[PDB]
Swiss-Prot record:
Domain CARD: 1-89
GO cellular component: protein-containing complex
Function, as annotated: Inhibits generation of IL-1-beta by interacting with caspase-1 and preventing its association with RIP2. Down-regulates the release of IL1B.
Annotated GO MF terms: CARD domain binding; caspase binding; cysteine-type endopeptidase activity; cysteine-type endopeptidase inhibitor activity
Protein name: Caspase recruitment domain-containing protein 18
Induction of expression: Up-regulated in response to TNF and bacterial lipopolysaccharides (LPS).
PANTHER family: CASPASE RECRUITMENT DOMAIN-CONTAINING PROTEIN 18 (PTHR47901), CASPASE-1 (PTHR47901:SF3)
Biological process (GO), any one: proteolysis
Tagged with keyword DNA-binding: no
PROSITE patterns: CARD
Tissue and organ expression note: Primarily expressed in the heart and placenta.
Assembly and oligomerization: Interacts with pro-CASP1. Interacts with CARD8.
Keyword set, alphabetical order: Protease inhibitor, Thiol protease inhibitor
């Protein structure tokens, strides 16, 4: 009963703008949910957003559903448009 990202993996990934990503991953660090190890994963910059997203959305969920909370929240303030399909409440 906790796999929002998973199902919504096709949405966030095929929508999130290269911009929000920079502002999103930045917020994560603030909470210190990730680690210099993961932070490096994304920084590596693979290719098109489709790639930089798949890793960002994944790395989060990896840290358990406890992160999903701050994620959906930070995203709401960063993007109210996309957050629409993720603005459950």
């Amino acid at each position: 009963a906790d796999q929002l990202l998973r199902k919504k993996r096709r949405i966030f990934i095929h929508s999130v703008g290269a911009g929000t990503i920079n502002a999103l991953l930045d917020c994560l660090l603030e909470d210190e949910v990730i680690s210099q190890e993961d932070m490096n994963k994304v920084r590596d910059e693979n290719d098109t957003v489709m790639d930089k997203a798949r890793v960002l959305i994944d790395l989060v969920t990896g840290k358990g559903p406890k992160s999903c909370c701050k994620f959906i929240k930070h995203l709401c303030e960063e993007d109210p448009q996309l957050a629409s399909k993720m603005g459950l409440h």
